[PDB]
């Protein structure tokens, strides 16, 4: 019916903590596997935090909010989904203040928000710039994701794809450096070939197939148009104004039936159909064409002058229409080649996340020391800053710092080493030695500096990770009454 009081906040903690305890060991290169029992006996031993919670059906509303936020994190950022849930769960697992001490949530939220502003201030001090102009330096960063993948055979090609494709979409003239992989870097699979034939196309691609030979095979100046008896006459006139301009290809938004394709085939042009509105806007920017209301209102200006060429070359038992150019019309297209669909699927998702890494690094050329170094470094600042924190908020303020130790805690647990012994010595290193280094080795299990090991992560990934974990913990703590109602 209705649940209120401390029962609500104590329940949301157990829910978010339970979801975090599942994926504690799926962090780092030693990500432990999880066996999901399907109702039909099917089993998948995946170790991805997203796919695990995606398939696990939950009933608690608080656990759903913790999952949906990680999903939204996965789209905006291609990394850090597992760390958001572990930190958000660990930040909430400190229930000593909520129940035993009877601290109001508004007091803790004042402490969590104060720590978030200080946690962000501590990361930017330990940051390090990047020489993004160097292709080998940025290549050393993208190799962290290429490891243990099928694209490791030609990783140099895999980085050059994502690195240039993002830079082509990178619009630095407007200042904010807006990047949109899904909008301006459309990716499509091409049957046949191999991973080595994967290249970038400087324009828009149309996956429609050629049904009849009466079409333009090669044109230097693509004129791209953009827009039974009674059916014949109404179609005979709408097609007349199109052919009057002598086009090279007609890309209409809505469908082109058989009789409409008949008159278009008399003009010997490629028949394209079933395209969306935004796609037409991208087609127009590819060649400078004009979208018109109806075929009746077509004018001589409706041309794709300036484009490179039109081509309907058959590649691997499939025709492909290209309106590409030898310039940069605010977009690109990744033509992923592969001898089979099994290899094509892996390279698609692999290079997609690789573009997200370069997207975050290029939005701000500032990295941070991973392997628990950033967490233990930030925790040292709050523990020192809390000494001057006059008030009762000092106790939960310090607890947030110790909650960040979970990241090196899980990395040490998966390696099999002593968690207390290394974490104790790890915290001492950040006190005396520099905080920008002395993290954790995820492969060896012992301590190591991050200057000697290139585990440097982006800054925007950690900022949105801590900001989302704190805002998620602040969210569920503000929930004090779960009620029904339609």
């Amino acid at each position: 019916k209705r649940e209120s009081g401390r029962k609500v906040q104590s329940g949301n903690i157990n829910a978010a903590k339970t979801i975090a305890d599942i994926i504690r060991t799926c962090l780092g290169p030693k990500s432990m596997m999880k066996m999901l029992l399907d109702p039909m006996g099917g089993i998948v031993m995946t170790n991805d935090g997203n796919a695990i919670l995606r398939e696990i059906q939950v009933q608690h509303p608080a656990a759903k909010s913790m999952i949906e936020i990680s999903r939204t994190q996965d789209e905006e950022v291609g990394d850090g989904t597992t760390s958001v849930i572990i930190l958000a769960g660990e930040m909430l697992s400190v229930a000593e203040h909520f129940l035993e001490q009877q601290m109001h949530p508004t007091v803790v939220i004042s402490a969590y928000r104060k720590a978030l502003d200080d946690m962000i201030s501590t990361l930017k001090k330990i940051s390090i710039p990047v020489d993004i102009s160097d292709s080998d330096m940025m290549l050393n960063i993208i190799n962290s994701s290429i490891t243990t993948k099928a694209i490791s055979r030609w990783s140099s090609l895999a980085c050059n794809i994502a690195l240039d494709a993002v830079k082509m979409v990178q619009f630095e003239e407007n200042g904010r450096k807006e990047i949109d992989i899904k909008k301006y870097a459309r990716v499509e699979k091409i049957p046949g070939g191999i991973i080595e034939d994967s290249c970038v196309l400087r324009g828009v691609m149309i996956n429609k197939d050629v049904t009849h030979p009466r079409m333009r095979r090669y044109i230097k100046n693509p004129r791209i148009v953009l827009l039974l008896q009674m059916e014949e006459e109404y179609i005979q006139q709408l097609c007349e104004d199109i052919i009057q301009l002598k086009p090279d290809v007609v890309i209409t938004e809505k469908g082109i039936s058989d009789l409409a394709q008949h008159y278009l085939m008399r003009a010997n042009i490629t028949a394209i159909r079933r395209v969306r509105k935004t796609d037409n806007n991208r087609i127009a920017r590819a060649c400078g064409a004009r979208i018109v209301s109806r075929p009746e209102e077509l004018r001589e200006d409706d041309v794709g002058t300036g484009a490179g060429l039109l081509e309907i070359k058959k590649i691997g038992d499939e025709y492909f229409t290209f309106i590409t150019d030898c310039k940069d019309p605010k977009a690109c297209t990744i033509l992923l080649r592969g001898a089979s669909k099994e290899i094509l699927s892996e390279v698609e998702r692999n290079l997609q996340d690789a573009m997200q890494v370069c997207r975050n690094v290029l939005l701000d050329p500032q990295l941070v020391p991973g392997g628990g170094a950033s967490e233990m470094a930030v925790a040292h600042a709050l523990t020192e800053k809390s000494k001057a924190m006059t008030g009762v908020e000092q106790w939960p303020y310090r607890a947030v710092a110790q909650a960040l130790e979970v990241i090196p805690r899980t990395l040490i647990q998966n390696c099999g080493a002593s968690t207390i012994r290394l974490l104790t010595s790890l915290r001492a290193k950040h006190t005396q030695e520099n905080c920008e280094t002395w993290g954790v080795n995820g492969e060896t299990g012992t301590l190591v500096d991050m200057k000697e090991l290139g585990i440097w992560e982006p800054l925007a990934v950690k900022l949105q990770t801590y900001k989302t974990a704190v805002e998620t913990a602040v969210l569920l703590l503000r929930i004090d009454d779960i009620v029904s109602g339609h």
Partner: protein, 521 residues
């Protein structure tokens, strides 16, 4: 701390469940290892019965209750497609690897440390094969020991000597010019009405349907085989007309009028017969796949022509390569170009049915292995053995190197891994010890199935050492040590190579399972 309709084993019980499943699957398949091993029955529920020791059939066709064990069942499907053997021993090593890992995990050792020991022992284990592999040139005697080593593990030791010479010669018939061996060049045919030991090779193809008419030649020593795909039976009107009748008699006139579509073409077969060497001491054969009227079978038989009907597409492609005549899709464009040439073409007579044989071909680049058995399940049993015996000789020729058997490599690699220290950390020494004792399950199980003591047999072959490269294995008949090279017991290189890479990958991944969550089961 849990949600409704959800369950998860957060502690190490997830490993105890997966480790228990592998031990259970180990105890099942260990009884069918080798020739002395027992057989397993496969009841389909509807009443069918199938006996087989092949681990892939006991994992692909059979159904398993445990969800975790079904994962290892899919691995055998992968192990079979790459090498064609080693699916049973792959499951034993996984169970014994996980068994030894559970012994150390109970002592507080992390699973990830054990997997690093397997990766180090595996890389050392692969190098040991390169040192002991014998790159003996492929000959008849060498392949007999290899095919005997494979076929004895699927039969009652009586069809081994019979099937060995047949399986060896089948590959040698297609193996020449250093070409990659293709198994599509050998077709497998089954026949009832005879015993099991009557299996023998056929130099050419064999067809189901043959000539059915009294006026046919029982054997054609030579003929110009004509390949065709045109039906010489009652068909529809192929011209700009149709069927319109007013009674049963007027309908019969349309049959006489429609039959003229074939009667002009049936004589066309008689024309090319008389045309291309129609004189004495010659013959002619038709292998038209489609149906043929008894009139055309009755007409051409008077001219001394063996005509066949109702064949398969695959047989027609093989028939063209054996003879040389290209398929004619329409009798109107007949010519000598559509003809071939072959030797003795006779008819094998069984108790009830009869089969066509096209032996003595010129250049077919293909043969057929005629299987005979009294029971239905015995045919499927022998077929699975020959397919495994063919891949055994294929791997021996495709990969010219072979290695010993009888667990001699496992006994040797176990001693090699013990004399090898890590290079990444010290605790990996435990994983190497688990890998060493895991490989010994094969010589242990072979002693159990043969009825000998598990410990006495292993200690003898493991204690046997000398100041020279010496092999040693289990003697299934005596139980004493045995040098596999001195008796003709050889395995493949790719089998043992894929075994170490397969067991290490799956035993690793099963150990990395930290929790088991029900996805709404």
């Amino acid at each position: 701390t849990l949600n409704p309709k959800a369950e998860v084993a957060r502690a190490q019980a997830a490993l105890a469940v997966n480790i228990s499943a592998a031990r259970g699957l180990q105890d099942v398949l260990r009884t069918n290892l080798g020739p002395k091993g027992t057989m397993k029955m496969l009841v389909s529920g509807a009443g069918d019965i199938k006996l087989t020791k092949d681990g892939n059939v006991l994992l692909h066709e059979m159904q398993i209750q445990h969800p975790t064990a079904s994962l290892i069942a899919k691995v055998a499907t992968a192990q079979d497609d790459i090498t064609g053997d080693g699916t049973t021993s792959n499951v034993l090593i996984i169970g014994e690897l996980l068994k030894q890992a559970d012994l150390y995990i109970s002592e507080g050792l992390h699973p990830r440390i054990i997997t690093e020991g397997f990766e180090a022992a595996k890389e050392k284990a692969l190098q040991f094969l390169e040192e002991v592999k014998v790159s003996r040139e492929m000959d008849r005697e060498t392949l007999i020991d290899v095919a005997r080593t494979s076929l004895r593990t699927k039969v009652h030791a009586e069809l081994a000597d019979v099937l060995t010479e047949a399986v060896v010669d089948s590959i040698l018939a297609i193996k020449k010019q250093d070409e990659p061996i293709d198994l599509f060049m050998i077709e497998i045919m089954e026949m009832k009405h005879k015993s099991e030991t009557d299996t023998s090779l056929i130099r050419g193809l064999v067809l189901d349907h043959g000539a059915r008419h009294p006026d046919m030649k029982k054997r054609v020593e030579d003929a110009y085989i004509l390949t065709c795909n045109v039906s010489l039976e009652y068909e529809k009107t192929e011209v700009n007309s149709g069927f319109f009748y007013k009674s049963a008699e007027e309908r019969e006139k349309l049959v006489k009028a429609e039959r003229k579509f074939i009667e002009d073409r049936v004589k066309k077969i008689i024309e090319l017969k008389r045309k291309v060497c129609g004189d004495s001491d010659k013959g002619f054969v038709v292998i038209n796949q489609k149906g043929i009227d008894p009139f055309s079978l009755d007409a051409l038989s008077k001219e001394g022509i063996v005509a066949l009907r109702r064949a398969k597409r695959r047989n027609m492609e093989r028939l063209t390569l054996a003879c040389g005549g290209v398929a004619l899709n329409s009798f109107d464009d007949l010519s000598p170009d559509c003809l071939g040439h072959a030797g003795l073409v006779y008819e094998y007579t069984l108790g009830e049915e009869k089969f066509t044989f096209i032996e003595k071909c010129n250049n077919p680049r293909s043969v057929t292995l005629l299987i005979k058995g009294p029971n239905k399940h015995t045919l499927t049993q022998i077929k699975d053995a020959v397919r495994d015996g063919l891949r055994a000789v294929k791997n021996a020729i495709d990969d010219g190197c072979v290695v010993p058997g009888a667990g001699a490599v496992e006994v040797a690699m176990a001693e090699a891994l013990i004399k090898h220290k890590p290079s990444v950390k010290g605790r990996a020494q435990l994983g190497v010890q688990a890998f060493a004792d895991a490989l010994l399950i094969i010589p242990k199980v072979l002693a159990q199935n043969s009825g000998f003591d598990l410990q006495e047999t292993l200690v003898k072959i493991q204690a046997e050492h000398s100041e020279s490269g010496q092999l040693v294995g289990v003697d299934l008949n005596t139980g004493e040590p045995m040098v596999a090279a001195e008796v003709g017991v050889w395995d493949n290189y790719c089998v043992k190579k894929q075994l170490l890479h397969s067991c290490t990958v799956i035993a690793t991944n099963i150990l990395l399972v930290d929790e088991i969550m029900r996805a709404g089961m």
